[PDB]
Amino acid sequence: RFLKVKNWETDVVLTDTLHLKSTLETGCTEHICMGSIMLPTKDQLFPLAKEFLDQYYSSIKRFGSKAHMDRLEEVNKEIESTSTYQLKDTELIYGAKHAWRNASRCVGRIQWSKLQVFDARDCTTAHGMFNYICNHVKYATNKGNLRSAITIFPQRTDGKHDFRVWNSQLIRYAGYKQPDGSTLGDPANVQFTEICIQQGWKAPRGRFDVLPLLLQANGNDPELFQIPPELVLEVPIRHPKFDWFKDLGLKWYGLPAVSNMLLEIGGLEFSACPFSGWYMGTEIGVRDYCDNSRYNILEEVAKKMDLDMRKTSSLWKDQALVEINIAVLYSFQSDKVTIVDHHSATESFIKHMENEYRCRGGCPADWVWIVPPMSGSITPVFHQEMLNYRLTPSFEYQPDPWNTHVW
Amino acid sequence: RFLKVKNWETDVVLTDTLHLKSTLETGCTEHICMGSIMLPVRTKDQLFPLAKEFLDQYYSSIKRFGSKAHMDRLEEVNKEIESTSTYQLKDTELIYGAKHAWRNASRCVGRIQWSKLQVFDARDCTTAHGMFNYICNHVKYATNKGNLRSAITIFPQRTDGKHDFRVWNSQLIRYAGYKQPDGSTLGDPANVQFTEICIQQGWKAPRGRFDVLPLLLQANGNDPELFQIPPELVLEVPIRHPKFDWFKDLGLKWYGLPAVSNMLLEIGGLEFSACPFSGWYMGTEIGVRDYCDNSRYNILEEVAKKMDLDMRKTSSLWKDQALVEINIAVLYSFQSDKVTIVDHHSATESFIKHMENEYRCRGGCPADWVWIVPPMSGSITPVFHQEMLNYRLTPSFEYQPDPWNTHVWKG
Ligand code: HEM
Ligand code: HEM
Ligand SMILES: CNCc1cc(C#N)cc(OCc2ccc3c(C)cc(N)nc3c2)c1
Ligand SMILES: CNCc1cc(C#N)cc(OCc2ccc3c(C)cc(N)nc3c2)c1
Ligand SMILES: C[C@H](O)[C@H](O)[C@H]1CNc2nc(N)[nH]c(=O)c2N1
Ligand SMILES: C[C@H](O)[C@H](O)[C@H]1CNc2nc(N)[nH]c(=O)c2N1
Ligand SMILES: [Zn+2]
């Protein structure tokens, strides 16, 4: 029950013990592995609080202290009375950093302890949320010198007063259907783009229309807000070699900020907690441009390269996929916007793994998601065995609000 | 209990019932996933259920379940087990078994072909020379002058585990690897240890960058013996590039026939420890792994240099750029010489069709996403966005320990 993981490129073997602290379930069983599947009261709550507080006071080398037992009793009494409890700032910051630390699918976690936590638990309105989000975006962006951050809105109470950011990301481009049949803008967002228009948004109808924010406070109806353009840093996409690349009329936003997940800490549920870092190149160029259910500009690009698109055997898709990705990195780098390539990030992650096996006894990791979506086997994480398990605090999926929210 | 998988590119959803037939274990638990772990003398006690289950499968497939033929056969195998502590498969059973071991190979992207397998029955074989002969005929048949044909050759099953047939090579055709005094490696780095064993066993190494290794063959638990495959049987393809004329001067070539020989075939409880099988290459198996993996030929740098790439920072993606050209060359070379190869786009598309057809007619298709997704350009192939259930069905191909670690040396 003390598990080894082997890197088959270097024969380096790490032993995992951290997994024995895992609580939540994987979805797998002895007879079936689900590793490639996308998605997975008062009595319940106090063990959850205790587990969290126990790891907190251990991490500050005050396990078993009067401070520890006092805090434990304090929360216990607050629960039995108020049927919930509140985190101290220290615990709030610790929890958020560790939800990222434990995010098994994230290749970026070497940075995990350098996270800026914004406490928005005093927030009461959509307008308020807009202010907090604007401040988040501006701080994180930092004129291209991106900084990781999370903003945390009030915890769930009874599921009727949830704070929700309805956008999947704070910054994303609109996608509109054409009567012609195809898709203008960005196809991933077509339903949300409709919802916004369905909610009173005036669509500029371009390719790169920044979506409005659709914020829900205290469980009320959500509200549209237009992010100040001056806060949305964008990079024009050009190629260092192909001058015709500029002509394609492509750009992307510098700030990846996922806003639809739920942050769980010591049993408490933060349904609104937008968090952001900086892009790995492939997230935009491999997925956001070349996925079939996305921009799918591959064909167009290959044409301009005058590649033989008659047989798949020419690997024209591959060749084009590469140039596109060379351009993304070039464009961001030239504009002094933070970006990391997939070789650098994966090299960092292997180092981070070594650190976590060393100082923590392991590191939950989801190979299916850690391996970049291109050039997989020439990155060091490919030949790296990984163990995937669920630690807490954590980021979780949650239903789309429009499937739930009673209007 | 029914289970669903979703293709997130097409929103196509399929339902798996076949997983209920799963006997063996994944390595996973409710609290841990070992999905990316490479690898996570049997008595009459547990052998007859294993036999019965197989024969139940077999007779279901031929629509004779519960027939007199089915029951008698059960009886015949039963009495044969309790009398001899093992049993023999009929020829029909052996062929069915071998095909379904491939069909059940959750890590194999090429399974659309599983029903077209040429089974060579080598169970009457008794010596290493006899093994050499069977293997030569396999190679000749499978190669078919470049128009490749899937085949497997099956040597006698394990008895007490002291009389194993083994092919000590990991593949029937593979290039030598030589560690040099200065720490550098001549040839395929992946084969150094095996090359050394061979040399020790009396092999005379030509010590070139592309020496075909000799066969090292073990029959009936005896010490293995060295044989040289006749060169006219080993079909090789010089690697050149369609636009880059300097690519030929890298002096690269590869062999045409991928034939894996160190795995164990399990059928109805019986263990076939020597069972070499071959099909044909997916382009990336040579171009990405066999040339560009840092623990292999690793010509990435040289190809990059010759392309005059910016190799200063990784964010130029010179590595990615070279990799594509190398795979372009590999496919180019094979197609030009009319040697069967498939590119990773064609093969993953084929597999998705295979999978869908298997969910409808069989109730599922076990698949290992970690291994099915190609090692370059993953997300622009349709398997990347395809959810997959992994579980172990029998008959199957299994790993087994390297023979030189377990073998008792006679002399
Ligand atoms: C700072 C630079 C960062 C980089 C380069 C990075 C990289 C990545 C990448 C490439 C993915 C794969 C996602 C996909 O392909 O769709 C991912 C997933 C993820 N990231 Fe990071 N990340 C960073 C920061 C952060 C931060 C600050 C957080 C939270 C505080 C975070 C939490 C997550 C989570 C929870 C997932 C997986 C979500 C899921 O289960 O679907 N990341 N990350
Ligand atoms: C005919 C065309 C075939 C193609 C294109 C093909 C392709 C592949 C590829 C690319 C892999 C991954 C290998 C790696 O990355 O190391 C694989 C695995 C595998 N193949 Fe197929 N294969 C073919 C035929 C066959 C045949 C004829 C058999 C057996 C009768 C077979 C059995 C297997 C098995 C058992 C694995 C998994 C090996 C493991 O678990 O380590 N394949 N195949
Ligand atoms: C749709 N794909 C599945 C998917 C679903 C959900 C949900 N619910 C969230 C997803 O976020 C991946 C992610 C999250 C945070 C990131 C940060 C901070 C930085 C970065 N560079 N990349 C990131 C990628 C992905
Ligand atoms: C060390 N690498 C992992 C590895 C270990 C072992 C073991 N033990 C076997 C391996 O075979 C994968 C395989 C097997 C058969 C194949 C056939 C017939 C055709 C083809 N094109 N590719 C194939 C690939 C790979
Ligand atoms: C079907 C498949 O499991 C699913 O599309 C996953 C696979 N791996 C991934 N890996 C990353 N990094 N991001 C993704 O969206 C996905 N998608
Ligand atoms: C650690 C990891 O599981 C291991 O390196 C696997 C990953 N996926 C693979 N996939 C294929 N097709 N072939 C391989 O050799 C591997 N290696
Ligand atoms: Zn699993």
Task: Tell me, letter by letter, the H, E, C secondary structure of chain A.
Answer: CCEEEEECCCCCEEEECHHHHCCCCCCCCCCCECCCCCCCCHHHHHHHHHHHHHHHHHHCCCCCCHHHHHHHHHHHHHHHHHCCCCCCHHHHHHHHHHHHHCCCCCCCHHHCCCCEEEECCCCCCHHHHHHHHHHHHHHHHHHHCCCCEEEECCCCCCCCCCCEECCCECCCECEEECCCCCEEECHHHHHHHHHHHCCCCCCCCCCCCECCEEEECCCCCCEEECCCHHHCCEEECCCCCCHHHHHHCCEEECCCEECCCEEEECCEEECCCCEECCCEHHHHHHHHHHCCCCCCCHHHHHHHCCCCCCCHHHCHHHHHHHHHHHHHHHHHHHCCCCCECHHHHHHHHHHHHHHHHHHCCCCCCCHHHHCCCCCHHHCCCCCECCCECCCCCEEECCCCHHHCCCC
Return residues 300-319 of B near A (CB < 8 Å).
Answer: 300, 314-317, 319
Helices B68-84 and B44-61, interaxial angle, to 10°? Answer: 160
Q: Note the Cα B227 to chain centre separation in Å.
A: 22
Q: Note the Cα A368 to chain centre separation in Å.
A: 16
For the record, the structure tokens of B10 come out as 């097409």
What is the CATH T-level fold of the domain A122-147+162-233+397-401, as seen in this structure? Nitric Oxide Synthase;Heme Domain; Chain A, domain 2 (3.90.440)
Q: How would CATH label the architecture of A234-256+279-344?
A: Alpha-Beta Complex (3.90)
- What's the CA gap between B143 and B195, in Å, rounded? 24
- What's the CA gap between A22 and B66, in Å, rounded? 48
Task: Judge: A326–B343 Cβ closer than 8 Å, yes or no.
Answer: no
- What's the CA gap between B38 and A383, in Å, rounded? 9
- What's the CA gap between A187 and A335, in Å, rounded? 27
Q: Note the Cα B49 to chain centre separation in Å.
A: 28
Which residues partner with B171 through β-bridges?
B260
Task: Judge: B30–A33 Cβ closer than 8 Å, yes or no.
Answer: no
Contact A24, A388 (CB under 8 A): no
CA distances from A63 to A59, A113, A224, A398, B83 (A): 8, 21, 46, 33, 65
Q: In which element (H, E) is residue B238 found?
A: strand B236-238
Q: In which element (H, E) is residue B46 found?
A: helix B44-61
Q: Give Dmax (Cα) for chain B.
A: 73
For the record, the structure tokens of A153 come out as 């809105």
| A389 known ligand binder | no
B187 Rama class: left (phi>0) / alpha (psi -120 to 50) / beta? left
Which residues partner with A6 through β-bridges?
A13
Classify each residue of B279-291 as buried b or exposed e, where b means 16 or more C-beta atoms within 10 Å of its C-beta.
bbbbbbbbbbbbb
Kindly provide the residue ranges of all beta strands, DSSP E only, lying in B22-76, ordered along the sequence: none
- What's the CA gap between B260 and B398, in Å, rounded? 12
Q: Tell me if A16-121+148-158+262-276+346-370 shares its fold with A234-256+279-344.
A: no
Contacts of residue B348, defined as CB under 8 A and 6 or more positions apart, other chains included, come to: B109, B372, B373, B374, B381, B382, B383
Q: In which element (H, E) is residue B153 found?
A: strand B151-154
Experimentally, the structure was elucidated by: X-ray
Which amino acid, one-letter code, is at B274? A
Q: How far is A31 from chain B (nearest CA, A)?
A: 5
Q: In which element (H, E) is residue B396 found?
A: strand B396-398
Residues of A in contact with B380 (CB under 8 A): 286, 290-291, 298, 317-318, 321, 374
Decide which of 3.90.230.10, 3.50.50.60, 3.90.1230.10, 3.30.420.40 is the CATH code for B236-258+281-346.
Answer: 3.90.1230.10
- What's the CA gap between B241 and B76, in Å, rounded? 59
Domain ranges of chain A: 16-121+148-158+262-276+346-370, 122-147+162-233+397-401, 234-256+279-344
- Alpha-carbon torsion (A325, B372, B234, B337), positive or negative: negative
Q: Give me the phi and psi of A169, to 5 degrees please.
A: -135, 150
Q: Strand A116-119 to strand A149-152: parallel, antiparallel, or no bridges (unpaired)?
A: parallel
The residue count of chain B comes to 411
- What's the CA gap between A164 and A263, in Å, rounded? 12
Cα(first)–Cα(last) distance of chain B, in Å? 56
Q: Does domain A16-121+148-158+262-276+346-370 have CATH number 2.70.170.10?
A: no
- What's the CA gap between A227 and A213, in Å, rounded? 7
Q: In which element (H, E) is residue B61 found?
A: helix B44-61
Cα(first)–Cα(last) distance of chain A, in Å? 50
Classified as helix, coil or strand, B110 is: coil
- What's the CA gap between B382 and B350, in Å, rounded? 10
Count other C-beta atoms under 10 Å from residue B91's C-beta.
Answer: 11
Which amino acid, one-letter code, is at B105? A
Peptide bond preceding B395: is omega within 30 degrees of 0, i.e. cis? yes
Most A CBs within 10 Å, among B25, B311, B324, to test the A interface: B324
Using a CB–CB cutoff of 8 Å, tell me whether B348 touches chain A: no
Task: Judge: A313–B292 Cβ closer than 8 Å, yes or no.
Answer: no
Contact A85, A79 (CB under 8 A): yes
Look up the CATH superfamily of B16-123+150-160+264-278+348-372: Nitric Oxide Synthase; Chain A, domain 1 (3.90.340.10)
For the domain bounded by B124-149+164-235+399-403, which CATH number is listed? 3.90.440.10
Residue pointed to by tokens 């579980």? B391
Q: Note the Cα A141 to chain centre separation in Å.
A: 16
Classified as helix, coil or strand, B404 is: helix
Using a CB–CB cutoff of 8 Å, tell me whether B373 touches chain A: yes
